[PDB]
Amino acid sequence: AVIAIHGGAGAISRAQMSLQQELRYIEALSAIVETGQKMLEAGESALDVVTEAVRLLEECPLFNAGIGAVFTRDETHELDACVMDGNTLKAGAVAGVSHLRNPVLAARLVMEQSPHVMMIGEGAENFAFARGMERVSPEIFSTSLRYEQLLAAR
Amino acid sequence: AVIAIHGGAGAISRAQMSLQQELRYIEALSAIVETGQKMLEAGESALDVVTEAVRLLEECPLFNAGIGAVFTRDETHELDACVMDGNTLKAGAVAGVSHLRNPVLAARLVMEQSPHVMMIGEGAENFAFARGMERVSPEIFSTSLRYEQLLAAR
Amino acid sequence: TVGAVALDLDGNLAAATSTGGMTNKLPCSVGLVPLVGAGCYANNASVAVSCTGTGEVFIRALAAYDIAALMDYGGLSLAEACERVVMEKLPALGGSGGLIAIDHEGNVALPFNTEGMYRAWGYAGDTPTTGIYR
Amino acid sequence: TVGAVALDLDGNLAAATSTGGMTNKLPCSVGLVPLVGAGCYANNASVAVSCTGTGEVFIRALAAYDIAALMDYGGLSLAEACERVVMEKLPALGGSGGLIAIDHEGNVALPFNTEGMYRAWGYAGDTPTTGIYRE
Ligand code: NA
Ligand code: NA
C-alpha cells in the first residue's frame, strides 16, 4: 500500500531559498503523506486516501490549490480539481469554481452523484450547494505571497 | 486524400422515420462531404476542410450543433466544439458557449491565437469578440423539433 | 454531436467536433466534445478521430486518443483499433455511440455500436458513400 | 497544482488533482487539472497518475493517460513510461513539469524535467521520503 503527493513542479531555485523556508515545505509534505500512509495502513481505500491528501494540500496555504490559490489577471481565483477511481474507472472534475473551499470534494461529488464527468463555474457550484457543500467567498483563498507574485508577473 | 463526417450516433429508428426524412439527412451529408472532397482536390489543408465541414454541420438544422442545437433543462443552448491539427498537434476547444453562431470557428481561434487549448463560457466568447467574431442571441439555434423533444424528455 | 476528419494532399490529418450537448442536460455540464483525446484527436504520425456517444464513457475511456494509442503502441490496424474501442471496450463501460477515423495511410473507418450513425466519406475526385443504419 | 496517487491494501489505484491555475492567467482558460487523461488518470489494471506542468502541452500529449497506454499497450515499465513522457515527449512539445504515478504492482515514480517538484511518498507503516530539488 503506497501514496505519492506533489505540491507543484516548477522553477524552485535553491539560491533564492533558505533551509528553514525549505523545511516549512518539507514538514507540510511529510505531515500530509504521513496521514495518507496511516489511512492506507488502517485499510482505507485509494480514493478516500487521495481525496484526504489533496484536501490537506488544498487547506495548506503553501500550495497552489484551495487556500493559497494563485490569482487570475482579473485578481480573481479560479480553482479546478479531478478525482479518478481505478476500481470503477469513474472520474469527476470541477473547472473554474470560486465559491467552493475544497474543489477536490466537489469533483468527488460530480463523480458519485452525477452522470457527468465535468461541471464548470456556477453550474458546478450550484450542483455542490444542492448536495450540502458550503458556499465560501473567493477571499478565503487569498494570500499576500500569491498577491505579490501577481503584481510581479503583472 | 479523403474526408469522413458524422452528424451523430444513437437510436435512429427506421420505424419512426419515412424515406423522405432519410433522404433529407442523406442529401445534407452528401452535400457537405462533397464540399470537403472538392476542397481536398483543390489543395485545401485537412484543417480548413474539417473546419468547413463542421461549420456546415453547424449551419444545417438537421444536426445537433450550431443551428438545431438541443436545449438544456433551463431551455437554453450550450455548445461545445474542438479542433486538432495533426501537423503541429495544436488543439483548440470551446465549452458552454451560447453567443457564437459557429463554435468550431471559435475553437480554431483558441487553437491559433491563444497559448491555451480550452476556454469556457463568457471567457471563450469574450476571447472571440475581441478578435472580431459576431455576437448572436442563443435564440438563433432554436428549432421546434428540438423544443418538442425537450417537452417529451420532461 | 457532428464531426469531420480529413487527410490532405500534403499528408496532414485533422479532426473537428461540435455539439449542442444532450436534450434536458444539466447546464454547465461538459461531455466528450471539447476534451482533446475524448471527443477529438489528430496526429500526422497515427490517426485523426472524431467521436459521438455517451460523453462520460468516451471521456473515461479517452476514446479518440485510445484509437491512436492502440495503433501506435499496440501495433493495431485502424480497423482493429476501431473494433477494440467501439464494439468491445465502450459497450463494457455501458457506453453507446461511434466515431470516424482516418490514419496517415488514408484508411477510413466509421464504427458505431448504436442503431444508426449519420455519416459520409469519400476520396478526393471520387463520389461519396453516405449511410444512416447498419 | 497539487496531486495524490495511492494504492490500497485491496489493490485499488486512485488519483486526484487540484489547482489555482497559472498566476495572471486569462479568466475561464482551462489547464490540465480538470481534464481526464491530461491532469489525472487511474485504472486498477495499469497505473494512477497525477500531473503538474504546462497545461496546454499535458492536454495535447494526454500525459496521465499516455503513461497508462505506454505500460498497457507498449509493455513499458512504470519508470520507462515516465522517462518517455516527462524527459522526452513533453520537452519536445515545449512542455515543462512532472507527474507522480503508482502502478498496480506498487512501483512509484516522481519524474519532473523542472528545477524542482515539491513531492513526497511512502509505503503504509513506513517512513516517507520528501524532496524539492532534482534526484
Ligand atoms: Na493550498
Ligand atoms: Na446543425
Numbering used by the authors:
A (entry chain CCC), B (entry chain AAA): 4 to 157
C (entry chain BBB): 179 to 312
D (entry chain DDD): 179 to 313
Sentences from the paper on this structure:
Similar observations were made for variant RDM1-12 with Ala at positions 210 and 211. Asp210 and Ser211 could be substituted individually (variant RDM1-37, D210S mutation only) or simultaneously (variants RDM1-3, RDM1-8, RDM1-12, RDM1-18, RDM1-24, RDM1-29 and RDM1-38) without any loss of autocatalytic activity. Moreover, the type of substitution, i.e. polar to polar (RDM1-24), polar to non­polar (RDM1-12, RDM1-18 and RDM1-29) or polar to polar/nonpolar (mixed combination; RDM1-3, RDM1-8 and RDM1-38) also did not influence the ability to autocleave. Moreover, a multi-step denaturation process was observed for most of them. Analysis of T m of the autoprocessing mutants reveled that they can be divided into two groups: those with decreased (RDM1-3, RDM1-8, RDM1-29 and RDM1-37) and increased (RDM1-12, RDM1-18, RDM1-24 and RDM1-38) T m values.
